[PDB]
């Protein structure tokens, strides 16, 4: 059924809608069995023939949809089929024949080789091969234990007249010779030249083993000649089939598409002929693609790399023509909307379903037995760069596909196996990555100049995707391969300009500050150079003034001093002094919005990133860690910064106009790890006691409220429901840090009961009693968490802990 399906669907018949959703349903239901080398279940693993079938299906549907006129209904039904088919199709699959006949119910073209002129320099050994094949017929009989006899034998059940050629009448010798004549005359007819390789022209024991080794091109000729045989009998077979008017024979399908079990006769005939040629001295003469390019990963990526320049071609002059007169002229509207309606979801799902294979390395096999090649990795990196260049300073034009393109750019920001990109990789592609970083740095510099259009482009497209890139580099520790040489300088001016945005106090940068803080925290987590604390920055190898050349500093304008590069970023000691003063003063989020959304993310991502480069972790590998710790952050520094964070939250639980607690807790989640035990009684116990007292007082107010029930109780209910929303807000603002703290110090309390911990359990228990006794507290909890979507962060926090 899949064979017939692959036959019909590439034509995109308007009646093939049901087969289209048939493929969709089949490949969402069954995808592990097709893709995973490990078997799905009792079913097992997919077949090579079926894998080739869906392969040819999906390339054929891709090109047929690329060339058919844009139909909204057909394309909309087709793209889930494409996504499901590609998801179930493994990327590393290599096809049976990369280059073959690829012909075109069925009308296989026959060969009029009787009319085709046949030289007589070869017909002598064609006749000898005809006699040899009838002798091999007798040999097959003697294998079948019905050794060939001259007269009719009833028990023989086989050929009753086959005789040695002397007594064998030539009237039947002609009618068994003529099919062999047509066979090899067709073989010389399909632009193949045969001749005696060496000098030369009823039971042959030596056979012709069709399974011996042979050259690729000549074996492809053998496959093409078996297809020729299939066409030869297929024309008369369809002549009889069209008389019937219904159904089809299992062998009445294209020879390449059909299964291996049925092509046995044609394959054995053609290959036995070819081995007969090779063994008996007949030379016949009529691509070389490596396995990496033979993979569908490389094949699809080749189509994709082709798509980027095509897309940019029409969209560039499309925005030009709509900026000049708004003329509806398009080069190929069908292809334009084919991309805009099909390819964006396709890459969206493919780079999420097969992201693990792309990220998987032959050295470090992240995937379950499947890894891409280094070649594939650098040109998916160039694929990402090309897609970025398609929409560089251009996402304002795209409105209908804007969420799609930005999302796909996040996905290509992920799954970037770039360890093997500067290594064994093309420096043109590395220069594409450098151009990405330099263009981003130039555009963000323009952004900070306007911030004191391309600015909205920075708002929607560049900032989140670049944050995703910094996240990816930090997570997969790709700093040594992604950011290096001029990329380091471009990131240097980027971080300087972003901290200048932190300096600036206008309303637009204030609104944009959350995304800037996310980007800078991810940057610091992916940053291999101690930009902060530049006192011992020369010890850090990754700095330009340690590895990069003095000559390149001279030609790039580097002042040979990181402080002279970016004097905007001050010393961590002064950040300590400032945050300590704010904590002691009880200063407000309104007073320090820049710190919260710029420098706190950087700090809380800097201490854990540089916890091994600082005195917090002396190098356990003494010979490897020869240089002294270049960074100055210690466990004492981490404890003290946690104290500052606890101090600012305890400063402004009272205010209600602060919804940045969610991002603050998310950023501070790693920085609450490795906290000293006295931090409990210093800050955790006072804070939990504060909200214990607040919960008791507010529930007492709700007690005097629930004493009554009327409209006045309703307006008081509004007041205490706002109070409850603040209660839930700060409970699940400070609890995620607390769970990691108590996870760290639970072993000590369990080994020795610590009265601070027991009092902390008493406090949280009293809040638990209040939560159980207060009904409106629970429903405000539900309302706040689900409507504001804290529940996802709650699940993530509970999963990591």
């Amino acid at each position: 059924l899949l064979r017939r399906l692959v036959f019909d669907v590439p034509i995109l018949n308007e009646f093939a809608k049901m087969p289209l959703k048939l493929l969709t349903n089949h490949y969402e239901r069954c995808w592990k069995y097709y893709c995973l080398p490990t078997g799905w279940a009792n079913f097992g693993v997919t077949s090579e023939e079926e894998l080739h079938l869906t392969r040819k299906l999906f390339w054929g549907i891709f090109d047929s949809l690329a060339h058919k006129k844009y139909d909204q209904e057909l394309y909309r039904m087709a793209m889930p089929c494409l996504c499901a088919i590609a998801g179930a199709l493994p990327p590393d699959y290599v096809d049976a024949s990369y280059s073959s006949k690829a012909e075109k119910n069925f009308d296989p073209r026959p060969v009029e080789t009787l009319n085709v002129i046949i030289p007589e320099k070869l017909d002598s050994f064609i006749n000898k091969f005809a006699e040899y094949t009838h002798e091999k017929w007798a040999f097959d009989k003697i294998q079948n234990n019905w050794s060939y006899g001259e007269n009719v034998d009833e028990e023989l059940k086989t050929h009753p007249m086959l005789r040695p050629y002397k007594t064998f009448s030539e009237k039947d010798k002609e009618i068994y010779r003529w099919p062999i004549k047509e066979s090899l005359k067709a073989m010389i007819a399909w632009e193949w030249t045969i001749e005696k390789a060496r000098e030369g022209e009823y039971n042959p024991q030596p056979p012709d083993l069709s399974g011996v080794t042979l050259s690729r091109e000549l074996q492809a000729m053998a496959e093409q000649l078996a297809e020729n045989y299939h066409n030869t009998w297929g024309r008369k077979k369809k002549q009889e089939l069209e008389a019937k008017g219904g159904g089809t024979h299992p062998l009445l399908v294209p020879y390449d598409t059909l299964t291996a079990k049925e092509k046995a006769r044609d394959r054995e005939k053609a290959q036995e002929l070819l081995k007969f040629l090779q063994m008996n001295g007949y030379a016949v003469t009529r691509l070389d693609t490596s396995s990496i390019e033979k993979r569908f990963a490389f094949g699809f990526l080749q189509q994709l790399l082709r798509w980027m320049d095509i897309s940019q071609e029409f969209i560039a002059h499309l925005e030009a023509v709509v900026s000049s007169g708004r003329v509806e002229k398009s080069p190929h509207e069908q292809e334009i909307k084919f991309f805009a309606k099909i390819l964006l979801p396709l890459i969206n799902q493919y780079f999420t379903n097969h992201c693990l294979y792309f990220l998987s390395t032959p050295a470090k096999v992240l995937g379950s037995g499947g890894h891409a090649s280094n070649k594939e990795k650098e040109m998916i990196t160039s694929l990402f760069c090309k897609l970025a260049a398609l929409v560089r300073h251009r996402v304002s034009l795209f409105g209908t596909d804007a969420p799609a393109v930005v999302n796909c750019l996040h996905i290509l920001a992920r799954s970037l196996d770039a360890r093997t990109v500067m290594k064994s990789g093309p420096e043109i592609v590395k220069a594409g990555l450098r151009s990405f970083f330099e263009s981003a740095s130039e555009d963000i510099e323009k952004m900070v100049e306007n911030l004191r259009q391309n600015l909205t482009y920075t708002t929607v497209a560049l900032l989140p995707v670049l944050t995703t890139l910094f996240q990816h580099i930090a997570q997969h520790q790709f700093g040594d391969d992604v950011i290096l040489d001029d990329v380091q300088v471009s990131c240097y001016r980027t971080l300087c300009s972003i901290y200048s945005l932190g300096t600036t106090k206008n309303t637009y940068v204030e609104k944009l500050r959350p995304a800037l803080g996310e980007c800078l925290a991810r940057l610091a987590a992916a940053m291999p150079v101690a930009f902060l604390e530049p006192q011992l920055n020369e010890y850090n190898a990754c700095s330009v003034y340690t590895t990069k050349s003095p000559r390149e500093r001279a030609i790039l304008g580097l002042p040979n001093s990181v402080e002279e590069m970016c004097p905007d970023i001050p010393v961590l000691d002064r950040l300590m002094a400032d945050i300590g003063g704010l904590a002691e003063s009880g200063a407000r989020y309104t007073e320090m919005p820049h710190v919260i959304e710029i420098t706190l993310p950087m700090l809380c991502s800097y201490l854990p990133r540089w916890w091994e480069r600082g005195p917090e972790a002396p190098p356990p590998a003494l010979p490897a860690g020869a240089p002294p710790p270049c960074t100055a952050v210690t466990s004492d520094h981490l404890n003290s910064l946690l104290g500052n964070i606890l101090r600012i939250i305890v400063n402004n639980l009272g205010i209600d106009e602060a919804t940045w607690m969610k991002r603050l807790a998310v950023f501070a989640q790693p920085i609450v790890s490795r906290a000293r035990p006295e931090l409990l009684h210093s800050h955790f116990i006072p804070t939990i006691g504060r909200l214990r007292k607040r919960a008791g007082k507010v529930v007492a107010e709700e007690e005097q409220l629930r004493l009554e029930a009327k409209a006045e109780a309703e307006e008081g209910e509004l007041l205490v429901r706002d109070e409850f929303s603040v209660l839930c807000r700060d409970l699940y603002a400070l609890y995620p840090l607390l769970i990691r703290y108590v996870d760290n110090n639970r072993a000590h309390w369990l080994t020795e009961p610590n009265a601070n911990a027991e009092e902390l359990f008493r406090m949280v228990g009293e809040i638990f009693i209040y939560w159980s006794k207060s009904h409106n507290f629970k429903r405000e909890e539900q309302n706040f968490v689900v409507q504001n979507e804290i529940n996802n962060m709650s699940f993530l926090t509970a999963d990591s802990k």
Binding site: A747, L750, F795
Partner: protein, 48 residues
């Protein structure tokens, strides 16, 4: 991976269950069933 504490759920009462351990080639383990509590480390950490 899903964030569930229990590894296995919905276990029928069956005939019962027994402590079992499988060792690969050249592996050394200490199957402390819990005869002596002082020898039983981390029980107070998780189980007491």
């Amino acid at each position: 991976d899903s964030g569930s504490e229990t590894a296995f759920r919905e276990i029928e009462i069956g005939d019962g269950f027994l402590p079992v351990c499988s060792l690969g080639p050249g592996q050394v383990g200490h199957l402390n069933l819990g005869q002596d509590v002082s020898s039983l480390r981390f029980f107070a950490i998780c189980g007491l």
